[PDB]
Amino acid sequence: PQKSKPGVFSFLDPLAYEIWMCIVFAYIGVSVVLFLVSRFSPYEWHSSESTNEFGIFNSLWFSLGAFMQQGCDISPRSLSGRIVGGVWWFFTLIIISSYTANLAAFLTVERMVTSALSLSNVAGVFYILVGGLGLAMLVALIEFCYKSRAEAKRMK
Template sequence: PYVMYKKNYMHLEGNDRYEGYCVDLASEIAKHVGIKYKLSIVMDGKYGARDPETKTWNGMVGELVYGRADIAVAPLTITLVREEVIDFSKPFMSLGISIMIKKPQKSKPGVFSFLDPLAYEIWMCIVFAYIGVSVVLFLVSRFSPYEWNLEEQDETKDPQTPPDPPNDFGIFNSLWFSLGAFMQQGCDISPRSLSGRIVGGVWWFFTLIIISSYTANLAAFLTVERMVSPIESAEDLAKQTEIAYGTLDSGSTKEFFRRSKIAVYEKMWSYMKSAEPSVFVKTTPDGVARVRKSKGKFAFLLESTMNEYIEQRKPCDTMKVGGNLDSKGYGVATPKGSALGTPVNLAV
């Protein structure tokens, strides 16, 4: 979104061939400073990094260092290493390093999806509570005289008919009573003793709370689309090996990991520099394409502004996960000691 060719750029000339945020920014800076300018794209397509062996600079930074350009208006990150050889204006945009992954598929409902509204631990507690209440009700009925049928045998009843049980709340009837209450269906028997009714009342209140919570959560689960992301932070990336991750080659993001002294980032850099095949990409579009083609097996580390922009563009199959790994800004660059430095800074 910073610098792009117009659709009909082949029929246009000069600065009219380009459009984007940085193109508009360059135009406004030129108006405030009172200069004429010509936009050009760097040949290698890089922002600028120093070769550790030859100590030479490439990309836009190299164009400024070696006098082939007067101003660099681009999403050029302000870093300490770059400020040693070029001057930066105040940041015109704040950002940070972020993680891009392929958007996971929406989870399909399974056979046991009805269990999702409550956690596994909650379901286990309900099962144990159900068994516990049934056992307590059984024991209470055993010890309470009000639960026993002590009436004399009816003489008119058929002698072949089995006699009524002396106590309605055997272990199986106790389980049936608790299950009927939990399912909000009731039961054909009920406790007659005070202690039994207290146990039953407590169980009814418990089931009322559980059923109400379950119903509310079930409605939310049915209306909200759920997606499960395998990665949520840089720590998640560092502690696994199934998903590869990399950065733009010859850029500030790569330099950030190379120079970082934080244990997590040192571990990530150790993986990236030794990974085979290489996890570094030449351009941002190459990194985005690799994320899309990898079927969730590659994460791209890039600036949050670009990450958020791509996430909102069709085909909308990438997403930003977690927070930013650092905080920095984009600045307009000029050669070291250039007379344009102060006017450009004031214009920004």
């Protein structure tokens, strides 16, 4: 009989789980196709460096930035890469608009099983952010330790 507060992951509520899974799949596919059409041709290569910066890691970064409405320091310059980028931009426009239409209403749904947003409605976002910061620190420290071991091997 008690009212059910929305979960700690309530920011995913506006879209169905199938939409989220297909979004992840589309992001992976777009990044892979961007890398493919940017780097496969030997005529795009000049030791030898490519004419563009769109490797697989950079392609994933560009696609993630485009979906987050942020942007990076690089942008596709060829016809095929720009086709990929433009269709990804259109997809992002539609999906982000649909998601953010009613996010605040979705975050405060009380289920039977206007007002300001409370911190309990975004505590999950905050938890994910702190976890990401901690994981980034862990990765950086692991890389530093590995490089120190490699330097020790070089000096021995």
